[PDB]
Amino acid sequence: ALQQDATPATREANQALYRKLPFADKTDFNNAHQGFIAPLPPAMLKGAQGNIIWDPAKYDFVKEGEKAPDTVNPSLWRQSQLLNIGGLFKVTDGVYQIRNLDLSNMTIIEGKTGITVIDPLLSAEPAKEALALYFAHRPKKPVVAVLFTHSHVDHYGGIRGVVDEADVKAGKVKIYAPAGFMEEAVSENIMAGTAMSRRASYMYGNLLKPDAKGQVGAGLGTTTSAGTVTLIPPTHYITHTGQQEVIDGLTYDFMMAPGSEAPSEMLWYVKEKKMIEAAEDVTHTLHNTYSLRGAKIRDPLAWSKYINAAIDRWGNEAEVIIAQHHWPTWGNDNIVKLMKGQRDMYRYINDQTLRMANLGMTRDEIAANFKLPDSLEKQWSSRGYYGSVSHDVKATYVFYLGWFDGNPATLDELPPEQAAKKFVEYMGGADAIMQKAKADYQQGNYRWVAQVTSKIVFADPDNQQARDLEADALEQLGYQAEAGTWRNFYLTGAQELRNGVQKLPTPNTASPDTVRAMTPEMFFDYLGVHINGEKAGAAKAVFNIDLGKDGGKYKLELENGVLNHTANAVADNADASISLSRDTLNKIILKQETLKQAEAQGKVKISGNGAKLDEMLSYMDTFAFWFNIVTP
Amino acid sequence: ALQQDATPATREANQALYRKLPFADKTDFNNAHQGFIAPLPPAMLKGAQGNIIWDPAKYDFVKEGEKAPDTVNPSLWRQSQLLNIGGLFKVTDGVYQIRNLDLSNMTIIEGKTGITVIDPLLSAEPAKEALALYFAHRPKKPVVAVLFTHSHVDHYGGIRGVVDEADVKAGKVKIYAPAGFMEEAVSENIMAGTAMSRRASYMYGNLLKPDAKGQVGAGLGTTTSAGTVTLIPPTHYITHTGQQEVIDGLTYDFMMAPGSEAPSEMLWYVKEKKMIEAAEDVTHTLHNTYSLRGAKIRDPLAWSKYINAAIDRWGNEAEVIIAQHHWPTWGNDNIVKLMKGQRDMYRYINDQTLRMANLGMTRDEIAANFKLPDSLEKQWSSRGYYGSVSHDVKATYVFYLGWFDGNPATLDELPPEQAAKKFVEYMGGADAIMQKAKADYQQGNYRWVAQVTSKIVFADPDNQQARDLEADALEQLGYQAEAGTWRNFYLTGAQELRNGVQKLPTPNTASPDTVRAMTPEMFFDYLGVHINGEKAGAAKAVFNIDLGKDGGKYKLELENGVLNHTANAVADNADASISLSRDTLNKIILKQETLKQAEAQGKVKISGNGAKLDEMLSYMDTFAFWFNIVTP
């Protein structure tokens, strides 16, 4: 089928929102263009081959002055043109940012000796063209210190595109991260990785075409970079909310996330610049509450209290605020106005969800009856371009109560494919449903049209008349979607409903630096996820692993279709004892080497019944990427 | 209230489970009867106003020898007759337990000077009689120390029914607890308290009659006591996995749960008795993963590693294991066997749910294709009597991925009330659904019958003919339910359709010891949850709270229907300033006094616009306990 135009119902709904929000307030466009020095270099970025790492003109069709197309939400169109305002910018005296060279920004602070780089993007190569752009318009100076606001891959992924590890190991450069950086940075997307990355293709529009009926943006940033993920273990750690550090003569007043355990989130304030580093916490969008790789950040109340603490502290004298994802704000009364609204927003999501949940309302009907106060709804900085008030309220309900709404009629519901066939039966077959869905599509009830038509699709994936009608309803819901994430999910579902899943390349896997940072317990947990519990449910096998002076000894127990691991343990009844170095284990994880070769070359000694080890490894499955999402 | 008999489909499903499990293995009954000394006093434990705190004959119809009724699942009935084996028991030389005087047990260990009490039950009155039943068969000695295993009301609720706080301050009694006991103990059922306690009435069958057609047990125990909930703050804290303590001559080797820097749960090993304290973490049921009042404990993988760490430690020399629930185990071979089967189950739940997730399966689909190995299926200690495999597996998906399954047709559905009206319309009305659902009922498809019949009831709560057919299907699903919590949920739901919800009294919310331990920030958060965000959206007020030495000052900013609070701050221009003692505030929180009554006695002074305070307080709703669960 073909991509349809906007229906009268969609145009009317988009037009109504265009007259609801303060579109006349061009304050954001003025802050975004402020301090502009130079645009981004014109050409794309490639790795060894022609694989595209970044395209500085992927969303050129989102012109700054042009009216929103009938197929794009007028609010998302405004954020997307505000988003593509990119280049090298000057925030204030001696601090500079490179925007729209990734999903996030890169901040460069100048000191007495050299420069300080903050959040060196998700990949090394975009971080390189960003630093080379800064040095194309400012004096050449050494990189003295690097900072990590969060402990996630979109904050540290390009560390060695800006600094050298030999200079970090030689003490020439320092890296500052929160105390629990290493424990949080590794665990981001390891256990549910394949499910998340396939979900991410829907989320960031990688399967869509950048035009008025497809990809347009992601809200928090334009799109993600696809280069090399790099990691250097930090050298200096911030431990408490009252800590202070002197970086190149500049005083950094820090503040850890709500005094939890090994805090992984960080906010600071340069006293001389009067500048708050908002990280991802104070941005110009409602946040998803998760990270780029699915790791959760915090709950709405903790987010709101995190901001309220940063208002009582620094609020009376702060004159600059910068973030990892958007443009700065320069007025003190403007900055407090911004934080105050962000603070109240997250507490409203938290407290009003708990109120209606205590009143007996279920997850979906709380999100329906959720009305924002007039002063918050009109704020541009809290529009759901990345997150969404709808699914954040639903997520807040599932935070306090379970997945279960309490109604026993939903405790053991039928699975999607079983229920669909029973739904189609009770509605009199596909043709009967089609006759009524076609009439609900005229009225613009695309949410309900998409819902019943999916029952036909899940009861019969071969019904192309239904898949096309569901895609049509999915497309209009995407045309009205204000969230770049919601729009990408809707249009990709419409794409794979008309055409089917496309086996595109799968941008490799884990990088050598993330596997190096990976801990042995995680690798053993990683192995247990691949064990087929059905095939291995009757097997028993015990192994001993010795990783030497860089890892230690581990006792592995396979039983009940389960792979347990215990550190600093040796089993006398081990079917086989394996002794290899961590470097040899790393390149085996990187698929750079096989276990069969490393054993034959003497890199792995397997003492005992080697047949048992091969038996366990045959119980392990492989995770195919392109699995069905919008279809069974 | 005409409750049906078991259908042929229900009898088939239950009998199939009988030929599936090792019912001939009566090992659990031997350990349940081991060490019996005396039964519980048959007299009921009545409250001050004649209320029932505990009934020792509540489940006398659950006889150990007789066969399970057709309306009770045979596996659950076996667990329920095991649960009613209560009284004073001897475990090993010098330690004793009282069982079935509460949902949990009370352990008493004899030292050189007196006795040591562990987990003094849920209420003071049962704990008082538990200590009396012990002293009815043992030399009278003073209680020397008290240990809390978890930081929840389930474990400390009856501390002062066993100990006097005067002797605790005078050093005559030491109260041991995990490091972060106080922070975790208070933040349980405060925010979503109303919703959870109402859902709890479904879970523990308090609205059902104790007979074969209704309430048979709660799996983890029979039921909960309804007495005075008390709390005395601990005196000695356990902080690390290596810490050792000599308590009344006996050596305790503690182990902390990993994850935080001040955990709230702990296990220990009494060296001189070769005994492991297993808490709730190694019992004879699959656990809910949450606590008694909703606060979550662990994910399945953390639960597995918790047991596994307690296996590496203490594993090969333990000769006795006791728990806060169920019966001990004595053979060292049997102890490791019990712990290993408990460990591998929770890892199986975690690792196998992530495997099917990475294969693209959704939450409800994973639970439907989830199958255990035969070695785990036969274990009695892993059967789902409290928690269940189905509901633990679904919660594990939500633990890693969100509530959203990825299908865009689920992202923005209709609320349950609007979707139900549209579903019934597409199905040709209620009577068309009824005729299909009546036939489905006779075919045994009770899960699907309750699902669509719920659409009728949510579209028309006054359709008593549908509420009956849904009740019939919910009733058969309860007769087949292996979990006492699921059975109570299914049967309480069917009861509230036939007769509706009968607003019987109220099951007591908070007690003075619980609120007195709350922090001022908690009361302000508790207040912000009650703010009706739509009556107070346009409202604006700033208040100053001063608690003096016992609390300090607080600035209460109130805009956008949001109650912000900031610690140790004053508002330069506030509507009113309130100064009162924390002891007076606790009287206002507990609804013993009001701020108008307290002000009429000079305890609260208000300097400013008191009528503005009266306005903002008028915006707060009262949470009705008896809200609708099975109907809108």
**What secondary structure does DSSP assign to A213-259, as a single string?**
TSB---SSSS----S-------SEEE-STT-EEEETTEEEEEEESSS
**Euclidean distance between the first and final Cα of chain A, in Å?**
20
Q: How far is B96 from chain A (nearest CA, A)?
A: 33
- Which residues in chain B are closer than 8 Å to A297, comparing Cβ atoms? none
Whether the Cβ atoms of residue A326 and residue A283 lie closer than 8 Å to each other: yes
Domain residue spans of chain A: 1-360, 361-501, 502-632
Q: How far is A560 from chain B (nearest CA, A)?
A: 6
Interface contact flag, B422 A566, Cβ < 8 Å: no
Collapse the DSSP code of A41 into the 3-class scheme (helix H, G, I; strand E, B; otherwise coil) and give the result.
coil
What tokens were used for B541?
């007020």
- Which residues in chain A are closer than 8 Å to B404, comparing Cβ atoms? 391
The DSSP code for A265 is B
What tokens were used for B48?
């001050």
What tokens were used for B479?
């007769």
**Euclidean distance between the first and final Cα of chain B, in Å?**
21
- Which residues in chain B are closer than 8 Å to A411, comparing Cβ atoms? 391, 486, 489-490
CB-nearest partner of B627 from A359, A538, A563: A359
Q: How far is A590 from chain B (nearest CA, A)?
A: 19
Interface contact flag, B493 A407, Cβ < 8 Å: yes
Q: How far is A551 from chain B (nearest CA, A)?
A: 18
Whether the Cβ atoms of residue B159 and residue B175 lie closer than 8 Å to each other: yes
- Using alpha carbons only, give the angle B349, B294, B127 rounded to the nearest 5 degrees: 110
B379-394: b (≥16 Cβ within 10 Å) or e:
bbbbbbbbbbbbbbbb
- Which residues in chain A are closer than 8 Å to B489, comparing Cβ atoms? 408, 411
Burial class (CB in 10 A: 0-12, 13-18, 19+), A488: buried
* DSSP assignments along A572-629, one per residue: TT-SEEEEE-HHHHHHHHTTSS-HHHHHHTTSEEEEE-HHHHHHHHTTB----S---S
Beta strands in B471-552 (DSSP E): 540-546
Q: Quick one: three-class SS letters along A418-467?
A: HHHHHHHHHCCCHHHHHHHHHHHHHCCCHHHHHHHHHHHHHHCCCCHHHH
- Using alpha carbons only, give the angle A404, A410, A412 rounded to the nearest 5 degrees: 95
Collapse the DSSP code of A396 into the 3-class scheme (helix H, G, I; strand E, B; otherwise coil) and give the result.
helix
Measure the CA–CA gap between A145 and B596, rounded to whole angstroms: 59
Measure the CA–CA gap between A306 and B235, rounded to whole angstroms: 32
Biggest alpha carbon distance in chain B? 77
Q: Quick one: three-class SS letters along B379-411?
A: CHHHCCCCCCHHHHHHHHHHHHCCCCCCCHHHH
Q: What helix, strand, coil percent values describe chain B, rounded to 5? A: 40, 15, 45
Whether the Cβ atoms of residue A260 and residue A357 lie closer than 8 Å to each other: no
Whether the Cβ atoms of residue A579 and residue A605 lie closer than 8 Å to each other: yes
Whether the Cβ atoms of residue B251 and residue B244 lie closer than 8 Å to each other: yes
Measure the CA–CA gap between B576 and B568, rounded to whole angstroms: 17
What tokens were used for B485?
């919590």
Whether the Cβ atoms of residue B368 and residue B344 lie closer than 8 Å to each other: no
Interface contact flag, B427 A426, Cβ < 8 Å: yes
Tell which residue, A528, A600, A609, has the closest CA to residue A575.
Answer: A609
Measure the CA–CA gap between B216 and A225, rounded to whole angstroms: 58
What tokens were used for B594?
């009001």
The continuous run of DSSP H or E covering A317 comes out as none
Q: How far is A359 from chain B (nearest CA, A)?
A: 6
- Using alpha carbons only, give the angle A490, A628, A463 rounded to the nearest 5 degrees: 80
Kindly report the length of chain B.
632
- Which residues in chain B are closer than 8 Å to A537, comparing Cβ atoms? 372-376
Instruction: Nearest chain B residue to A373 by CA: give it.
Output: B537
- Which residues in chain B are closer than 8 Å to A302, comparing Cβ atoms? none
Burial class (CB in 10 A: 0-12, 13-18, 19+), A317: exposed
- Which residues in chain B are closer than 8 Å to A569, comparing Cβ atoms? 312
- Which residues in chain A are closer than 8 Å to B422, comparing Cβ atoms? 448, 452
- Which residues in chain A are closer than 8 Å to B407, comparing Cβ atoms? 416, 454, 493, 629-630
Tell which residue, B277, B336, B226, has the closest CA to residue B97.
Answer: B277
Interface contact flag, A351 B259, Cβ < 8 Å: no
All residues at 6 or more sequence positions from A616 whose CB lies less than 8 Å from its CB, including other chains: A531, A536, A539, A541, A543, A558, A563
All residues at 6 or more sequence positions from A262 whose CB lies less than 8 Å from its CB, including other chains: A178, A179, A180, A183, A184, B261
Measure the CA–CA gap between B572 and B593, rounded to whole angstroms: 30
- Which residues in chain A are closer than 8 Å to B308, comparing Cβ atoms? 564, 566
- Which residues in chain B are closer than 8 Å to A426, comparing Cβ atoms? 427, 433, 436, 452
All residues at 6 or more sequence positions from B603 whose CB lies less than 8 Å from its CB, including other chains: B580, B581, B584
Interface contact flag, B355 A425, Cβ < 8 Å: no
Q: How far is B112 from chain A (nearest CA, A)?
A: 36
For tokens 């317990």, what's the residue? A521
CB-nearest partner of B398 from A358, A403, A426: A403
The DSSP code for B329 is B
Measure the CA–CA gap between B531 and B520, rounded to whole angstroms: 17
Interface contact flag, A490 B402, Cβ < 8 Å: no
Interface contact flag, B409 A474, Cβ < 8 Å: yes
Instruction: Tell me whether strands A174-178 and A236-238 are parallel, antiparallel or unpaired.
Output: parallel
Within a 10 A sphere around the Cβ of B83, how many other Cβ atoms?
Answer: 29
- How far, CA to CA in Å, does B489 sit from each of B2, B278, B478? 18, 28, 8
CB-nearest partner of A411 from B372, B406, B486: B486
Instruction: Nearest chain A residue to B440 by CA: give it.
Output: A422
A181: phi then psi, degrees, rounded to nearest 5: -65, -55
Within a 10 A sphere around the Cβ of A42, how many other Cβ atoms?
Answer: 7
Interface contact flag, A202 B406, Cβ < 8 Å: yes
Half-sphere exposure of A239 (CA within 13 A, CB side): 3
Measure the CA–CA gap between A18 and A5, rounded to whole angstroms: 19
Whether the Cβ atoms of residue B224 and residue B122 lie closer than 8 Å to each other: yes
Measure the CA–CA gap between A130 and A125, rounded to whole angstroms: 9
Identity at B246, one-letter amino acid code? V
Q: How far is B538 from chain A (nearest CA, A)?
A: 7
Whether the Cβ atoms of residue A67 and residue A14 lie closer than 8 Å to each other: no
Interface contact flag, B427 A427, Cβ < 8 Å: yes
Q: How far is B481 from chain A (nearest CA, A)?
A: 11
Instruction: Tell me whether strands A576-580 and A541-546 are parallel, antiparallel or unpaired.
Output: parallel
CB-nearest partner of B192 from A294, A344, A401: A401
What tokens were used for B445?
């498809």
Interface contact flag, B262 A262, Cβ < 8 Å: no
B77: phi then psi, degrees, rounded to nearest 5: -65, -35
Instruction: Tell me whether strands B540-546 and B576-579 are parallel, antiparallel or unpaired.
Output: parallel
CB-nearest partner of A394 from B192, B403, B407: B403
C-alpha torsion angle, residues A17, A22, A23, A24 (rounded to 10): 150
CB-nearest partner of B354 from A374, A493, A529: A529
Measure the CA–CA gap between A130 and A136, rounded to whole angstroms: 10
Measure the CA–CA gap between B165 and B170, rounded to whole angstroms: 9
Measure the CA–CA gap between B558 and A68, rounded to whole angstroms: 37
What tokens were used for B567?
């610690």
- Which residues in chain A are closer than 8 Å to B558, comparing Cβ atoms? none
CB-nearest partner of B529 from A290, A355, A371: A355
- Which residues in chain B are closer than 8 Å to A529, comparing Cβ atoms? 351, 354-355, 358
Q: At how many degrees (to 10) do helices A430-442 and A446-459 cross? A: 160
All residues at 6 or more sequence positions from A207 whose CB lies less than 8 Å from its CB, including other chains: A201, A492, A495, A496, A502, A504
